[PDB]
Each structure stands twice: as C-alpha cells, then as structure tokens.
From a paper:
Unlike other human-infective Plasmodium species, this parasite contains a set of adhesive proteins, the PfEMP1, which are expressed on the surfaces of infected red blood cells, causing them to bind to blood vessels and tissues. The scavenger receptor, CD36 binds to many classes of CIDRα domain (CIDRα2-6)2223 and is the host receptor most commonly found to interact with parasite isolates from patients and with laboratory-adapted parasite strains27. CD36 is a cell surface scavenger receptor that plays a role in fatty acid uptake, angiogenesis and phagocytosis.
We coexpressed the ectodomain of CD36 (residues 35–439) together with the MCvar1 CIDRα2.8 domain (residues 576–745 with a C626S mutation to remove an unpaired cysteine). The CD36:CIDRα2.8 complex was subjected to crystallization trials with in situ deglycosylation and proteolysis, allowing a complete data set to be collected to 2.07 Å resolution. We therefore modelled palmitic acid into these electron densities and observed a close fit. The PfEMP1 CIDRα2.8 domain therefore binds to the α-helical bundle at the membrane-distal tip of CD36, close to the major entrance (entrance 1) to the hydrophobic cavity and in the region identified previously. Secondary interactions are made by a smaller α-helix (residues 668–678) from the CIDRα2.8 domain (mediating hydrogen bonding to CD36 through E672) and a loop (residues 647–656; again hydrogen bonding, this time through D650).
Author numbering:
A (entry chain B): 576 to 697, 716 to 744
B (entry chain A): 35 to 434
The structure:
C-alpha cells in the first residue's frame, strides 16, 4: 500500500532499475546471457543462468504486487480501465520519455531501447512482455550452459 | 392597475405573452478579446500577463422565439425551451470572425486542472508536447468563441470532448426546460421560475446559494417598488443573483427604474456573510477572502471557468494583481436593467460579464512547470444589451 517513497516515485524507480538490471546481466555476464546462434557451453555459466532465472521470477512477483496497487487507484479517468491505463503508460515511446525526463540520461535510454528492440517489444504490458522474454532467455541460457564444467 | 393585472398574465392574447414568446427588442452581444502581449514571458518567467482588449465583435442574439410553449392549467405555470442563436454583425464589429488573437490554451489549462493523478499528468504532458501545444495559442475569433478541435485532446486515449470553445455549443441548442408561473392565480408570481430542468435548486452550490430565485430578468411581477430587491436566475453564471434600485430614468417618454447589480453580490463572506456558499475552495480564494470572481467549474464539467465583471470591476486586488492592461470603470463595466415599474417589463439592459480561466503550475506538465503562481486569466468580456424600439416605446405609452 505504501512503498519506501510515494507510489508514483516508487513505480518509476522500480521500472527503471529493473530495465537497468536486465542490461547489467549482459554487461556483467554476457559470455553466458546473449542471443548468439552458436550454442557453445561456457564454463561457470550454468550458475549465472540460474541467478538470472531467479531474478526473472523475483521481478515477475514484484511486478504483480505493483500492478495490484495500480488497479486500486480511485482517481483514474472515467470510462477507461486501470489496465488500458497501465498499458498506455508503459507503451515503448512513452516509457522511454518518462524514464529520460526522470533520470536525464540519454545513453541509458539508448541501451533500454536496444534491449526492448531485441526483446520483440521495440502478461499484458511492456514490462510483462519483457519479463516473458527474460524467462525464455534464461531457459535458453540453461539449455546451452547445462553444466558448470561442459559436458 | 386593473387592465395591467390582466395584460401582464403569461397567456395567449396578452401584451406580456406576445413579447415573452418573441421579444420586440433586438439583442446584441458584443465581445472584447484579451489579446496576450507577452505569452512567452508569462510561460517561461511567470511574469504578469500583458493584455490588450480587441473589440467589439458584435453578434445578434436571442432573436429566436421561445419553443415547446406548454401551459399547465393546474398549477398556472407555462413551460418552454429558449433556443440559442448568434448572427455575426460585420457592420457593428471592429474586425472579421477570422481575426487572430494570442490566448490561453484552454484545453491545456483545463486538463491540467481536472487530472491531478500524476500518472495521468505524465500521459497528458507527452500528448501536449507531441501536438506541440503550449501554455498559449493563436485562435481566430470564430474558434475561440464557438469551438475548435484541440490537437492535444484529439490524442487523449481515454474519452474526452475534443472540441473546445468558450460558448461551445451555442447554435442549435436550447436552454430549458424552464417552468414559470403564468400569474393567472396571483399576479405577484408572473414569470417567476417554478423549476428549471425539473428542479428548484441547481445542485451546483450548497445551502441557499443553490436556489433558483425570481424571473429570467426579461420582466418581473407588476407594480415594482423602489425598496424592492429584484431576484433573477441567469443560467450563464449558473446561480440566482439580484438587482437593486439606483436611479429614476426616462426611456423614450417611458418613466423607468434603473436597477443595478451591486458589488455586494460579488463580495466575500468577509463583507457579505451570505456569500459563503459561493466559495468553492480555500486556496485560490485565500480562505474565502478574495471576491469579485465566481468559480463555476461544477457547471462547466470541471473546467476551471471563473466568471467576473469586465476588467475585474468590484474585485479583490489579488485577483487583478497578475494582469497588466486592465482599466475598470463602474459606469462602463457594471450590469443594469431598466424596468418599467407598472408592467414590470425590462425595456433596456446591459449585462456585462467577463469569462476567465484559472491556470496553476504543474510538476509533470512541462508547459506549466515554470509557473510560480496561479492566474485567473481574463479571456474575454462581453456586453449583452438591448433597448426598446421607438415604435414599441410609443406603442407602450399608448396601449399601456
Ligand atoms: C456595451 O458596453 C460597452 C462598455 O460599457 C459600451 O462601450 C463603451 O461605450 C462608451 C460610450 O457610451 C465609450 O465611452 C466614450 O466616452 C467618451 C465620451 O463620449 C469618449 O471620449 C470615449 O472615446 C468613448 O467614446 C466606451 O469607450 C465604450 N467602451 C468600449 C470598450 O468600447 C457599448 O457601447 C455597449 N453596447 C451598446 C450597443 O450599448
Ligand atoms: C457565459 C458564461 C459561461 C462561460 C463558459 C466558458 C467555457 C470555457 C471552457 C474552455 C474549454 C477548455 C478545455 C476542455 C478540456 C477538458 O475538459 O478536459
Ligand atoms: C426583453 C428582452 C429581455 C432580455 C433580458 C436579459 C437580462 C438578463 C440579465 C442577467 C444579468 C446577470 C448576469 C450578469 C452577471 C455579471 O455581470 O457577472
Ligand atoms: C525571462 O527573464 C530573463 C531575465 O531573467 C530574460 O533574459 C528573458 O528574456 C525573459 N524571457 C522572456 C520570454 O521574456
Ligand atoms: C419540441 O417540439 C418538437 C416539435 O417538432 C418536438 O419534436 C420536440 O421533442 C420538442 N423538443 C424537446 C427538446 O422536448
Ligand atoms: C450560427 O447560426 C447563424 C445563423 O444560421 C450563422 O450566421 C452563424 O454562422 C452560426 N454560427 C456558427 C459558429 O456556425
Ligand atoms: C489568421 O491566421 C491564419 C493563419 O495564419 C490566416 O489564414 C488568417 O488569414 C488570419 N486572419 C486574418 C484576419 O488575417
Ligand atoms: C401571491 O404570491 C406571493 C408570492 O409570490 C405571496 O407572498 C402572496 O401572499 C400571494 N398572494 C395571495 C393573495 O395569495
Ligand atoms: C432548495 O434548497 C434549500 C436549502 O438551502 C431548501 O430549503 C429547499 O427546500 C430546496 N428546494 C427544494 C424544492 O428541494
Ligand atoms: C434565494 O431566495 C431565498 C429566499 O429569499 C434566499 O434565502 C436565498 O439566499 C436566495 N438564493 C440566492 C442564490 O440568491
Ligand atoms: C482560515 O482557515 C482556517 C483553516 O485552514 C480557519 O481556522 C479560519 O477560521 C479561516 N478563516 C476564515 C475567516 O475563513
């Protein structure tokens, strides 16, 4: 019901930090987490595919709780649902505008736009589409990096 | 007195009935637009609004006869719808309906006022910027007055009315249903409104401020005294108000009483304690101490419309504080009705009102982010006036 800060402040901070964390998985463990067609198992990557898989489920659960408080707003426009509201708010072009206006970092926007483009974005919103994509990448990660010491 | 008590009743064949269905007086509505001289200085630096008045832009109004006239023999009431129409008089105007003015961007001020939810303000900001809308805009007279499709509102993904305009809609509309006493059973009740849209109260205001009192001000019950307070309902300001005796006047040989709209009607509960229920909030009104303005947002679908007198006559100095270029004058900007005391008929009047919109700063809407104060922005002011025709004036003193 209340977060560390105002719901509006928390909402955008969480969205921003999850998008950043999604990028940081590649910046830190891209030898494991990538879209490279060549499926060769790298030593020590299995462990990292599991942590990345764990993170996806943690964010999916956190997101569910955030969507639940959004649906409790009593000042939303008349004849419009909380879900159409959420969906409009998280459409790629508006999402990137709000993040940039709040953080003022254009390069961070470039990285996010690239991440969303490669996710097929660029269970209903952008965040949901991305968390679904993340679940498929962590599953692909485990199918390639099946063992910490390949084979 | 005897011939009066019968020719004043609102029923078929009387002098009051013919003049009631369709007036013998030509009514004009002259507009003056407040043309914004420093839109960028206001928007960027939160400076005072430099205005220049442009006008008159004159329209012939109230030329249409009353419609769906239906007498009720039971309660001695007569019902109607008053159709609305405006015909431009290029002959009586300073310019064309095509004249351009820099004016407050109406949709931006209203949407920012109405939608306070910060997630909504974030969608709206994006939409205001994509349509390259700003705090001010350039509109023709025809658009500002009667309506335009707003490019920002046209993008709003939830249901909104995308046409904006100060008097939108006007043509092809009708104000009613008004139910008035015909005065058959008691002449002291002729033309006083029984109901308007089936109610005795507007549901706009709380307590006594919500009451629909008096006539429509086109006539009042006969045998008017100088000690009398004349009550009347004006749907354009969304409340009942009153007029009070000023002076004796001779109109084309007809001795009439000049009734005026007193400054007290506009006073705060500090000067006038009865006006408490016309104070809508405690911030803009500075704890209900500001005066000369009326927040009519409840009857304008939440839009921050503020009615005042032209050039903020009879208004608090804080209301006039952020505007440069106004010159109030009691004689010039007041409202008055010249009433013939025997019949109770209004033979001449001048109804002078100013239309304003409140605009506040915003954290999320960039175009209002630099504002350092709230502004009650004067949009235009009008003089709706009519005088008895020479022929009708000579027919009056002869037939009455
Ligand atoms: C509707 O109300 C208008 C505002 O009161 C009114 O216009 C004003 O009319 C007076 C004349 O009656 C003008 O004042 C004149 O005063 C001196 C003395 O003659 C002259 O030196 C001035 O130049 C001026 O002519 C006001 O200036 C004028 N105000 C504006 C802003 O136009 C209308 O005439 C009224 N409408 C009708 C049709 O009655
Ligand atoms: C004669 C007195 C009545 C005055 C009424 C003036 C009406 C002004 C309204 C301007 C439209 C503003 C934009 C609407 C946007 C929205 O409602 O969301
Ligand atoms: C015979 C023609 C009759 C038409 C008379 C119409 C008179 C209406 C008077 C209403 C005045 C009140 C509204 C103005 C208030 C203001 O100045 O803010
Ligand atoms: C705003 O103020 C600055 C001075 O502080 C001035 O240079 C600038 O011209 C002003 N802006 C406008 C649009 O008048
Ligand atoms: C008024 O009269 C017309 C006559 O054609 C009728 O059809 C209409 O319903 C009436 N108007 C209203 C709004 O009641
Ligand atoms: C309103 O109707 C009159 C008469 O038909 C016409 O002159 C005027 O242009 C119309 N106004 C608008 C805004 O269409
Ligand atoms: C108002 O501006 C528009 C657009 O520039 C123009 O077409 C129109 O002619 C202007 N009005 C007048 C009276 O010139
Ligand atoms: C006539 O009506 C008025 C109110 O409008 C009332 O005060 C008065 O008593 C009535 N007169 C009679 C004779 O009923
Ligand atoms: C109108 O409102 C007042 C409250 O101030 C009340 O006394 C009156 O009875 C109401 N009128 C009707 C007919 O409901
Ligand atoms: C309406 O008339 C009643 C009775 O005189 C009065 O108490 C009330 O204040 C009036 N209301 C308005 C808004 O003028
Ligand atoms: C001013 O507002 C406060 C509450 O915020 C209240 O105590 C005070 O009496 C108000 N003053 C007047 C005269 O309305």
């Amino acid at each position: 019901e209340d977060k560390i800060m105002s719901y509006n402040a928390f909402f955008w901070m969480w969205v921003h930090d999850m998008l950043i964390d999604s990028i940081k998985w590649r910046d830190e463990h891209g030898r494991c987490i990538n879209k490279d067609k060549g499926k060769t198992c790298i030593k020590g990557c299995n462990k990292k595919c599991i942590s990345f898989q764990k993170w996806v489920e943690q964010k999916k659960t956190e997101w569910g709780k955030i969507k639940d408080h959004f649906r409790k707003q009593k000042d939303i426009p008349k004849d419009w649902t909380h879900d159409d509201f959420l969906q409009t708010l998280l459409m790629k072009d508006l999402l990137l505008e709000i993040i940039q206006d709040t953080y003022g970092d254009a390069n961070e926007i470039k990285r996010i736009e690239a991440l969303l483009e490669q996710a097929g974005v660029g269970k209903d919103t952008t965040i949901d589409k991305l968390l679904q994509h993340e679940q498929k990448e962590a599953d692909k990660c485990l199918k390639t990096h099946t063992d910490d010491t390949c084979p | 007195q005897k011939t009066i008590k019968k020719q004043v009743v609102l029923e078929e064949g009387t002098i009051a009935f013919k003049n009631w269905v369709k007036t013998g007086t030509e009514v004009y509505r002259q507009f003056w637009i407040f043309d914004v001289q420093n839109p960028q200085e206001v928007m960027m630096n939160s400076s005072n609004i430099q205005v220049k008045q442009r006008g008159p832009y004159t329209y012939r109004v109230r030329f249409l006869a009353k419609e769906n006239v239906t007498q009720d023999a039971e309660d001695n009431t007569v019902s109607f719808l008053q159709p609305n129409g405006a015909i431009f008089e290029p002959s009586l105007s300073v310019g064309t309906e095509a004249d351009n003015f820099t004016v407050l961007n109406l949709a931006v001020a209203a949407a920012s006022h109405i939608y306070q939810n910060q997630f909504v303000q974030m969608i709206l900001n994006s939409l205001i910027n994509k349509s390259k809308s700003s705090m001010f805009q350039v509109r023709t007279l025809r658009e500002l007055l009667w309506g335009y499709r707003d490019p920002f509102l046209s993008l709003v993904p939830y249901p909104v009315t995308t046409t904006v305009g100060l008097f939108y809609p006007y043509n092809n509309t009708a104000d009613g249903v008004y139910k008035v006493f015909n005065g058959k059973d008691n002449i002291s009740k002729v033309a006083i409104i029984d109901t308007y849209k089936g109610k005795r109260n507007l549901s706009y205001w709380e307590s006594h401020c919500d009451m629909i009192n008096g006539t429509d001000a086109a006539s009042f019950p006969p045998f008017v005294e100088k000690s009398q307070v004349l009550q009347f309902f004006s749907s354009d300001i969304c409340r009942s108000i009153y007029a009070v005796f000023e002076s004796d006047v001779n109109l084309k040989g007809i001795p009439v009483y000049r009734f005026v709209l007193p400054s007290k009607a506009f006073a705060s509960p500090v000067e006038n304690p009865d006006n408490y229920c016309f104070c809508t909030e405690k911030i803009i009104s500075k704890n209900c101490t500001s005066y000369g303005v009326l927040d009519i947002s409840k009857c304008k679908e939440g839009r921050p419309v503020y009615i005042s007198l032209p050039h903020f006559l009879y208004a608090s100095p804080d209301v006039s504080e952020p505007i440069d270029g106004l010159n109030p004058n009691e004689e010039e900007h007041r409202t008055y009705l010249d009433i013939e005391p025997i019949t109770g008929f209004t033979l001449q009047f001048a109804k002078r009102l100013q239309v304003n919109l409140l605009v506040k700063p915003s954290e999320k809407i960039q175009v209002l982010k630099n504002l350092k104060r709230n502004y009650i922005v004067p949009i235009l002011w009008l003089n709706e006036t009519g005088t008895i025709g020479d022929e009708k004036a000579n027919m009056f003193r002869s037939q009455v």
